[PDB]
Design a protein around this ligand. Structure first.
Ligand SMILES: *[C@@H]1O[C@H](CO)[C@@H](O)[C@H](O)[C@H]1NC(C)=O
Ligand SMILES: *[C@@H]1O[C@H](CO)[C@@H](O)[C@H](O)[C@H]1NC(C)=O
Ligand SMILES: [Ca+2]
Ligand SMILES: [Ca+2]
Ligand SMILES: [Ca+2]
Ligand SMILES: [Ca+2]
Ligand SMILES: [Ca+2]
Ligand SMILES: [Ca+2]
Ligand SMILES: [Ca+2]
Ligand SMILES: [Ca+2]
Ligand SMILES: [Ca+2]
Ligand SMILES: [Ca+2]
Ligand SMILES: [Ca+2]
Ligand SMILES: [Ca+2]
Ligand SMILES: [Ca+2]
Ligand SMILES: [Ca+2]
Ligand SMILES: [Ca+2]
Ligand SMILES: [Ca+2]
Lengths: 31, 276, 271, 271, 276
């Protein structure tokens, strides 16, 4: 059969974003 | 038998008693005497086993029924003790420093146990009933227990750091651990040196009598603090020399075995039934 | 205290153990060496949580510590509704163990004694002289009907008969009906004339290791070993405390509420 | 709790005042300035003997001292069967003293408030947040269904609304049915979600000087003075204690036994 | 509940309600597979036990119910075999040079044996009836036997000279000795590296099956020459690869269990007969 076991945990999600910066041709005035 | 186990047995209160069966019981049974090594050392004789056999024969045992098993001491004998004969008599020398161990040994050999393997590395373990214990035996058993909570987190102990676990046994040849029931425990044991099993006490053994040589009434074969029953199978005698002890055992074998009963010797010689 | 008439067929009520645990409290007394061997700073908290698993609400169990039997014997105060004292057995302290058990397992009605002013005698077998303090040294001089010492001199206290020396608790039992002059070091110990009313049913004593040596009755012919005097074998204190927690149901079953009306307002716990 | 059918023709029983004085304990709480002004090391014994003249057995009256109202408000433990708190009036502390009264003149069922992870709200008028400690600085940020704050940012405590600063005790009442984010100094404070069940009948408060300013109910439309809120003008503390001793029967008359079955952990001074 | 007595059980030959649930075996009972080490060597997979557990679980056995045990060879396994699961299957490889040994092994595990100690130094021994044998186990059992006469003198041997003893076992890991019944014998055994026990064959061991992986039918679990029974628990399969053997075992595990029954000596019904 099956047993129920509990897990309450105090978590700290530490995350962040990343950025994709792709620039267009020319002299660099356009992204 | 099994299909008629749950059937009544009716007996009239006037059926005539049958003639004595002790003679036939001796003629059809075998007796095992378990004694320390110091007993044989003090006796300092090689033919003493043969003389004891002859004296037992004088007491009504066929030549071949009495066997003598020698064990070093209480601690070493506590590692997987084996009960071979129909009737087992264990002469435990009393040492005031090993009271618990003595009790433990008695608790193991005066009672039937039903045991299961314990993979302490993979499961938490509960003790469901007062009859449930953890019997561990080996060369040296050190048991450390962390009681968890309803959230599978150690109480007073870090579930990952064994150093914070609670010491309930250190370098034990045998130990019967009893923890709070209904609590999941994380166990760490010296598995290389000892084996731990989840055991259930089924009842008395009735074919193992423990004679305590010297001391006082210190045995406690029940983990319940408010009971220290003294059954007929746990006897106590005073001694100054071992030959007198053995003569007392021989001369009162009738009384010793009248307190014991056949029908209880298991097919295996082990001190517990095992279910893997 | 009125007569109680009952029928032999009244239905049994449900178990009161759950509500008893919810409405009472348990004081557990242990020696300092127990805490020393445990070597944990939160063992009280984990024991309380285990008791809660067993039924007792948090904060209901109180853990009190005493250095040893002798120190605990100096006027021991028992607070909770149910008291369990884990007394470690020492082969050389049998009489002190017995005296402590007699003091805490029985109810005593005590009055002060003025040894320096009046002679004192013991009326009956229930009457004793309990002296406790830092150091009790009691010497006794029995007197004949002419208020003159027997085997002792009233003026000279050296001739007195020594019944206690440097004891932290001693129950003195002398021949009843005889007047005695008492020399007691009152500066460091107080002696009281006490009568045994009956058993204290809210105090159990668990003797850790040893044999049944307790004698809570001065009669040579009786060694009761009541149901409130348990004994266990041990090697580690954690196992002892686990056994106490697991079988607390049986331990409380062996005990009953105090059931004595006290004229002294002392410090207790009562949830 | 069962129905209690009684007859209006029953005869009045004799005065139980002597019996309750004999079988109960009285606790007197006074400020340290009382003992300072009295300036006598034996004043406890003098009051005990006066109470004995009033009927209370020696030892049943217990005298407890508190530095001041602010200090006493940190988990006030009331021990005896009957508690009388002599509270000096200070026009600057009208709320604080009131809060103290609200804490000790009523029964509170409290549970922990783990603010740092949970969002809390008050369900009804009986619900309050009792915070106690060395320094309770509580800031509140009301929220809405979208979890955003009203005039506050949950991520910037500086915008939280200030409801208490450096408080030894504070009873916080916010709008019911609204979730709030709480920021209180947990190091020097503990906040509990509490429900007032009813009056605490074994605790009376005697305000020494001033005027009737206590408001033990958060509702602005009610400022009731129960019989357990006395107010006496004073110039000497000896006179205060004499009037407390002389009218002890009247004070206890205004009080009743606690009658509540608790679950908390507090020692008591009972006989 | 009534454990010490054999009470008759009555049933109706026309009784209805012939329900069944083999699933009860799977979830409640445990399966043990005993195989030689060379099987694992040939398989040469580090997770084959997991795959076999998965395949068994296809047949209804919950994970953890099936256990796998390794033994080096027939001779090593024969040293005091310990089969503890509810259902035991032993994949015994056939070796034409080790017929008797295999038979002995099967005779030890396919039957139920009630064994008592033997003190060859003290006592002479007989074999009372056809079911009485002398089972010796150890690293190297070498048993020599000298039959006596009614005057206690040896027949074709000298009791005081072991060189004349009639050797019946030489360097055996396990050997079951059957001698003439009703004749006292002096036994010389290598007690240091071998223990000999006086055993009685109670009956079949229901919960142990032996699958012979290889040659023809050669097992003789009966000492009687006139009978060589082939019970349903003695299976035989032809093989070339061990994965095939294990797949056949798993696919037909239901039939293998059907050929077996719960150990009649291992349930509460048999309490106080011999064991549990
Ligand atoms: C039983 O004992 C009696 C008296 O000792 C004896 O006469 C009898 O033969 C014995 N056997 C039976 C079957 O009664
Ligand atoms: C009550 O008081 C009355 C009058 O003082 C007295 O007669 C009586 O004995 C007292 N006790 C009871 C139980 O009525
Ligand atoms: Ca041990
Ligand atoms: Ca710890
Ligand atoms: Ca347990
Ligand atoms: Ca016990
Ligand atoms: Ca003493
Ligand atoms: Ca003298
Ligand atoms: Ca006396
Ligand atoms: Ca006595
Ligand atoms: Ca305030
Ligand atoms: Ca704001
Ligand atoms: Ca509100
Ligand atoms: Ca108001
Ligand atoms: Ca020969
Ligand atoms: Ca062989
Ligand atoms: Ca034979
Ligand atoms: Ca055959």
């Amino acid at each position: 059969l099956w047993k129920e076991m509990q897990y309450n945990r105090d978590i700290t999600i530490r995350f962040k974003f990343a950025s994709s910066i792709v620039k267009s041709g020319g002299l660099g005035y356009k992204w | 038998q099994n299909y008629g186990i749950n059937l009544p047995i009716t007996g009239s209160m006037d059926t005539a008693y049958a003639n004595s069966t002790q003679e036939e019981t001796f003629l059809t049974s075998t007796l095992c005497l378990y004694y320390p090594t110091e007993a044989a050392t003090e006796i300092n004789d090689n033919s003493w086993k043969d003389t004891l056999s002859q004296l037992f024969l004088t007491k009504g045992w066929p030549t071949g029924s009495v066997y003598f098993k020698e064990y070093t001491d209480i601690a070493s004998f506590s590692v997987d003790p084996q009960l071979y004969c129909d009737y087992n008599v264990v002469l435990m020398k009393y040492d005031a420093t090993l009271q618990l161990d003595m009790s433990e040994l008695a608790d193991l050999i005066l009672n039937e146990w039903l045991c299961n393997p314990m993979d302490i590395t993979l499961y938490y373990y509960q003790q469901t009933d007062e009859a449930n214990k953890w019997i561990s035996m080996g060369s040296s058993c050190t048991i450390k227990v962390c009681p968890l909570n309803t959230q599978t987190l150690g109480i007073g102990c870090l579930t990952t750091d064994t150093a914070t676990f609670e010491e309930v046994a250190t370098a034990e040849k045998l130990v019967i651990t009893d923890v709070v029931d209904g609590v999941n425990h994380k166990l760490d044991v010296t598995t290389a040196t000892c084996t731990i099993r989840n055991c259930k006490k089924l009842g008395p053994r009735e074919n193992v009598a423990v004679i305590q040589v010297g001391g006082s009434d210190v045995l406690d074969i029940t983990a319940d603090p408010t009971t220290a029953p003294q059954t007929e199978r746990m006897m106590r005698i005073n001694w100054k020399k071992w030959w007198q002890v053995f003569y007392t055992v021989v001369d009162y074998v009738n009384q010793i075995i009248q307190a014991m009963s056949k029908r209880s010797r298991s097919l295996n010689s082990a001190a517990f039934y095992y279910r893997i």
